[PDB]
């Protein structure tokens, strides 16, 4: 009950915000897992879409683990919640999955910006630096990459052109 | 809606049982993740317990992925549910975590034996072979290893002896 | 006209400030280019001064390119202006060029500090981290190096001693 | 004020023409820089167009530096002017950028042919050889390459076909 | 007396705070030096405790040197004070030394957080980034490691169990 | 309180003299540290003077550590005092720093000769051999090197000639 021997300048509200961010990162890992195996279906059959989203799934589990490490490093206590099944919808196409991923990463970035605003308000420069170093530029690069992918698929004629998704699978994700 | 072009000798009940087993494997990955970071806390501080359970967590995510591949290979459709937060309790000690892991793996094995009985009842030898090849002996080895670990910790004087858990961490999990 | 699909927490004023900083970095590349070839003249003939300033010129073009990448990563639109010819004056000596470079880098640093104050005012932690990571310490090291060079040239007897500039060229810039 | 000790058979008009050519080469570097980052935008997203034009930008800066070296080698004095922002227009498409580049390189070649006619009129065989050796065939190869690129993009169905620009990006510029 | 040629956006109060932090880092190096040689005594004789604290001593001297470099880089003037002999007390045991080290590192971290609050108040983003990059996470990792060590020693039965300190020396610090 | 089990032929007065010599070696490390960073200032800017004195600082910390080892080897008890800030004065020039270092090393040598006279008076041949083996010739070589450096700087025209200190920095300390 009494304080962690390591805890210093770590607000209860920051501790709770980090637990919510852990859940969000595990949720993002689950969304990309579901998206991956959609492209593995025999009636979709785009293997590089499947590999691309599995890699993204594995990266989100690493992002969750790094926040669980941070919680312990600062003397906070991890509190886990259910990982909700993916919302987005039935995946429909390579383009629609890429658009769901863009929205997911823009929602994760908004959560991280709220987390950074709280750490700023509580004058926690270690937590500010943590978020900036490990999360904020990774989100900007992820969002830019997904926007690039959505643009190419749209220009190529997706989702109507099954040829467009096939050739994007080989040339961009291959 | 209409049948997958690949589907052959794959009962609707088998398809549903495989989706339930996917959820159970993701749940087991989550239980071991939680257990891992407990041992990373500054007031527990057993780093080889933490690494041992993280590795086990990563192995369960691989077990889930292999069942999602199987579902697609057979022309079934993956249906995901929420991943429940870990039940077990507050982890308390290295011994108590090992005992929770033993119970978890004995519950996963019972699920797989029920799955095998269903595949047997539906005369699905491919699914029987899948379960036997990739799951049943992995469960028997996991259960035997966790029983060995629980025995050693008990003989060494855990959970009262903090020396016992420390030296087990170095010599068995190190 | 309508918003970039990637744009998030990126103020119009930040977007414009980044375009002004791009112009300033290209201007700094031009100042160092001019300084370089002054030392290549047959009546100046200090080859290590020439190489030192050419390298500095190439570094400023890289600094401009990284800001053009950032503008696109954040969903801003690059707006280019004329690159003004160098102001400073006729270069006169190794010491006078080093003093012009010190003033240039102290003016670029003041621009970057104003840019950081704007990003702080608009609560853009990604842009704050970008400036701190890629620009602020590079400016402090550049300013310290140029101050060191100016000090040595002054102590050695420059600009009157042509021997001083010759031996500095060989021993410090060689 | 008085003559460079190295100057021999180098007409004042040649000296001035070389300074104008320096400005034109820096302007061409700026045009290709702008074109490069257009293709880096999230709503254009053709990375090999972007790399192709950045390389061309870097080559034009080298062409400018070689003329600044020549000016000093002959005992002329470098005189720099503002580098104008790119004219061409909004870039619109891969085809339109390639067409702007073709017009740019045909304007640079006309400048170099005028420069060669002046050196011929002033009986400066060193300057004639300089232009022929380092510039004239580089312009003919650049113009031929850009014409080839424009032809392919037109035959492939650009600019209407976003598929055409995508596949040209992978197969020709990749 | 008059201003350093390099000084820009570096408040007199920041300059003084950096000199106080230099003294604190040298004091921390001295505390760990004293602790090291305690464990080298023939009536204590724990060689891995001795090596662990000597390494920590050498790391604190590096932390002091990096702040003396920063002071010069920013155009401040180093002002040195006596390095006080270690306070803590007679070292008594491996556990008591580890507890003194935990308190030392939590006092150094509080000094660095006060330093960061001053740099924030004076809008010095270069100094904020310096502290965050080189100091704040190094303090969080140091504090977490020392808390882990204190926990293990307590669980193992230290300081009463001389066996506990012996086996910790071999297995954790060895 | 009672005697160390290892103590043999080690006089209380020798024990106290060794503690005073430890303080003197730490003081010499501090003097050279201060001298080092003086030459790192932007208005002094002699980098090989700075490296030379930092190396000397690191060597004095090693000399202190070896005496703390000796104290324990002989069964004496280390007693630490404050490390006084450097006396010498404001450093002024490369020559003045070298002259302060010569005086420092001649004061350390006089302390060691007094220490050797005490060990001789107490018939401690182990301590006599320790001082002769590890300290006395290191002091004679240090004093000879600093005298050589002072001579060269004086002959070269230091401290008036800033050229002299610059060229000594490159050729002797480089
Ligand atoms: Cl509190
Ligand atoms: Cl919580
Ligand atoms: Cl929940
Ligand atoms: Cl980046
Ligand atoms: Cl059927
Ligand atoms: Cl189902
Ligand atoms: Cl559900
Ligand atoms: Cl087996
Ligand atoms: Cl053991
Ligand atoms: Cl062992
Ligand atoms: Cl808005
Ligand atoms: Cl603008
Ligand atoms: Cl303009
Ligand atoms: Cl640095
Ligand atoms: Cl003439
Ligand atoms: Cl001209
Ligand atoms: Cl102009
Ligand atoms: Cl050819
Ligand atoms: Cl291909
Ligand atoms: Cl001021
Ligand atoms: Cl001060
Ligand atoms: Cl003092
Ligand atoms: Cl870390
Ligand atoms: Cl006695
Ligand atoms: Cl004493
Ligand atoms: Cl004292
Ligand atoms: Cl010798
Ligand atoms: Cl020389
Ligand atoms: Mg949430
Ligand atoms: Mg990712
Ligand atoms: Mg993430
Ligand atoms: Mg639900
Ligand atoms: Mg970064
Ligand atoms: Mg279930
Ligand atoms: Mg396992
Ligand atoms: Mg499993
Ligand atoms: Mg529940
Ligand atoms: Mg088998
Ligand atoms: Mg401007
Ligand atoms: Mg530079
Ligand atoms: Mg720059
Ligand atoms: Mg003008
Ligand atoms: Mg900040
Ligand atoms: Mg940095
Ligand atoms: Mg022109
Ligand atoms: Mg070219
Ligand atoms: Mg050209
Ligand atoms: Mg204009
Ligand atoms: Mg000819
Ligand atoms: Mg040729
Ligand atoms: Mg203090
Ligand atoms: Mg440390
Ligand atoms: Mg420190
Ligand atoms: Mg005192
Ligand atoms: Mg860091
Ligand atoms: Mg003394
Ligand atoms: Mg020495
Ligand atoms: Mg010494
Ligand atoms: Mg005093
Ligand atoms: Mg000897």
Curated annotation (Swiss-Prot), chains A, B, C, D, E, F:
One of its GO terms (molecular function) is identical protein binding. One of its GO terms (cellular component) is ferritin complex. The keyword ATP-binding does not apply. Its EC number is 1.16.3.1. Disulfide bonds: none annotated. InterPro entries: Ferritin, Ferritin-like, Ferritin-like_diiron, Ferritin-like_SF, Ferritin_CS, Ferritin_DPS_dom. Belongs to the ferritin family. One of its GO terms (biological process) is immune response. This is Ferritin heavy chain. Keywords: Acetylation, Cytoplasm, Cytoplasmic vesicle, Iron, Iron storage, Lysosome, Metal-binding, Neurodegeneration, Oxidoreductase, Phosphoprotein. Changing residue 25 to A: Reduces iron binding and oxidation rate. Stores iron in a soluble, non-toxic, readily available form. Important for iron homeostasis. Has ferroxidase activity. Iron is taken up in the ferrous form and deposited as ferric hydroxides after oxidation. Also plays a role in delivery of iron to cells. Mediates iron uptake in capsule cells of the developing kidney. Delivery to lysosomes is mediated by the cargo receptor NCOA4 for autophagic degradation and release of iron. Changing residue 105 to A: No effect on iron binding but the oxidation rate is severely reduced. Residues 8-157 form the Ferritin-like diiron domain. CDD domains: Euk_Ferritin (cd01056). The record marks 20 as: Essential for association with cargo receptor NCOA4. It is an enzyme of class 1 (oxidoreductase). It comes from the Eukaryota. Fe cation 1 binds at residues 25, 60, 63.
